[PDB]
Amino acid sequence: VLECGVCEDVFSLQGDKVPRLLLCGHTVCHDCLTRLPLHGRAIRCPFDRQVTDLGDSGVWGLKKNFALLELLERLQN
Amino acid sequence: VLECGVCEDVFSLQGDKVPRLLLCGHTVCHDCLTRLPLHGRAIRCPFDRQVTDLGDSGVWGLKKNFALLELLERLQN
Ligand SMILES: [Zn+2]
Ligand SMILES: [Zn+2]
Ligand SMILES: [Zn+2]
Ligand SMILES: [Zn+2]
Structure with missing residues (x-):
């Protein structure tokens, strides 16, 4: 298991x-990303302040960390 | 351990x-990324062919998968 650096909860394989x-x-968990400040469809990384621009799907348009999810699944299974 | 999906070698915490x-x-390992075919100043993902635009630093400008590296380091120790 690995924790989100913002909320310190463990990542899930899907969902919030x-x-x-x-x-x-x-990487940040979906829920924390929805709780971060947004300014004109732009979100700042909480660790380094760098800007990521969001598209029409918002946080749901941010890509999942596929390799991390594969590792978490392999460790679980 | 987790392998790069292209070369099937295991990821390292730093280097090639x-x-x-x-x-x-x-995610793709650095070395495979340097060996992949280029389309202009852009590289196509070897899994889904989607385009990532490269800057003047080429592959070195692609970001490290920080969360994956954190988990891999925890697994090593
Ligand atoms: Zn979180
Ligand atoms: Zn960041
Ligand atoms: Zn590789
Ligand atoms: Zn891809």
Whole structure:
């Protein structure tokens, strides 16, 4: 298991705690991303302040961290 | 351990096998990324052919998969 650096809860394989990617390369859980400040469809990485621009799907358009999800599944299974 | 989906070698915590991110959310090891075919200043994801635009630093400008590296380091120790 691995924890989200913002909420310190463990990532889930899908749903409200799924790991999503910012353009700086950091992962944050979906829920924390919906709770971060938004300014004109732009979100700042909480760790390095770098900007990721959001599209029409918002946080749901941020890509899942596929390799992390594969590792978490392999560790679980 | 987790393998790069292209070369099937295991990721390293630094160096030529470090996991780097494409904008589609997939991770590929640094070395495979330097060996993949180029389409202009852009690289196509080897899994889904989606395009990631490269800057003047090429593959070195692709972000490391920080969360994956954190988990892999925890697994090593
Ligand atoms: Zn979180
Ligand atoms: Zn960041
Ligand atoms: Zn590789
Ligand atoms: Zn891809």
